[PDB]
Amino acid sequence: ANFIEKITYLGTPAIKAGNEHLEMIVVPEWGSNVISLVDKTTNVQLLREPETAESFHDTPTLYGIPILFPPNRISDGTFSFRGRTYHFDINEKDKHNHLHGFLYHEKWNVVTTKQTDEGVIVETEIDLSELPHVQKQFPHHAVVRMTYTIKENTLFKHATVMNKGKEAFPWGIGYHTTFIFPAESSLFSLTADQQWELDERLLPTGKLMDVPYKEALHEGMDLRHKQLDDVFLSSYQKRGGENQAVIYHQHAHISIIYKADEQFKHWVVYNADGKQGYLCPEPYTWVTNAVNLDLPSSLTGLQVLEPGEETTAKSSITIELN
Ligand SMILES: OC[C@H]1O[C@H](O[C@H]2[C@H](O)[C@@H](O)[C@@H](O)O[C@@H]2CO)[C@H](O)[C@@H](O)[C@@H]1O
Numbered sequence: 001a002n003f004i005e006k007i008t009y010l011g012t013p014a015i016k017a018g019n020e021h022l023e024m025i026v027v028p029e030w031g032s033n034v035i036s037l038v039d040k041t042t043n044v045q046l047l048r049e050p051e052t053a054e055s056f057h058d059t060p061t062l063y064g065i066p067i068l069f070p071p072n073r074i075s076d077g078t079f080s081f082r083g084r085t086y087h088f089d090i091n092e093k094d095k096h097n098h099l100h101g102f103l104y105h106e107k108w109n110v111v112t113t114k115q116t117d118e119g120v121i122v123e124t125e126i127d128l129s130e131l132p133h134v135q136k137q138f139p140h141h142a143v144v145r146m147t148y149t150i151k152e153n154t155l156f157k158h159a160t161v162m163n164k165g166k167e168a169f170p171w172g173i174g175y176h177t178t179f180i181f182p183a184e185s186s187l188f189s190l191t192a193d194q195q196w197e198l199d200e201r202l203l204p205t206g207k208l209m210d211v212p213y214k215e216a217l218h219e220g221m222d223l224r225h226k227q228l229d230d231v232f233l234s235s236y237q238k239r240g241g242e243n244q245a246v247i248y249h250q251h252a253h254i255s256i257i258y259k260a261d262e263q264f265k266h267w268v269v270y271n272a273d274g275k276q277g278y279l280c281p282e283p284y285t286w287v288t289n290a291v292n293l294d295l296p297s298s299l300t301g302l303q304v305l306e307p308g309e310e311t312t313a314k315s316s317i318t319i320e321l322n
Pocket of ligand 1: 092268272
């Protein structure tokens, strides 16, 4: 049994959808952000929610599930692709980078909803060819469609990226998913053995290094007095196994298993100063500044869409009670 219900979320139109296990709220105008995700059995909110509309607009990448197309930093907002030079807005001033892409602060359209025994589906879409300021930076006819499915104890979250134009383009996508994470009573695990060395502008030097505490990270560790803003390489490419982050809440015994497919090659993990009570385990299909690295695409995760092609990158959030 499942429902869809149109609502107002802090003065903006939104769609609440759910079954008897999970409820989401997606906010199409706010970069199609999944702003709320509630575990129905225990009635716990899983995502960091904004106090007011105003605070959300202040930091739209730090609540719910913001969409990063493309994810993280591009040095000087410049790169070339197949002979051609691109200049993206340098919105991160102190580090002279473009940061977080085109989509987390634009209006997406609701394209359909569907309800059956197989679950409840909400689909949103945005066509970058309709955003003139985006076209000035990135003159290509990219269309991104999100497919959200709640089925049983899992929110599935699929991005389909389409090239509807006449020239090829590089792309990557990531999510700035922000979970409630009380430092005292939560544990975190991640399928990674290595991470990217970063310079003072948070750009990769191109070198990998071992994660010294990787056994701890594998099994589940606390993050008390650890400040993270780290680009981890998923262990999947090299060892197989899983590709996922796990948050465990110790009081309510809730596991949150955030899986991503083989295209999701990197995880940025961010917790600010470690005192803010949240955690962002961010899966990305390409590494920070991927466009500018002369490294194999199997390592960076850089991908290209030829005219007429499309790709679907899949991930999911499963709630288990134990
Ligand atoms: O723009 C500076 C910005 O960066 C830091 O936090 C970033 C983080 O570096 C990124 O990797 C990303 O995942 O999320 C954050 C931006 O939402 C600083 O901690 C932050 O104060 C600063 O605004």
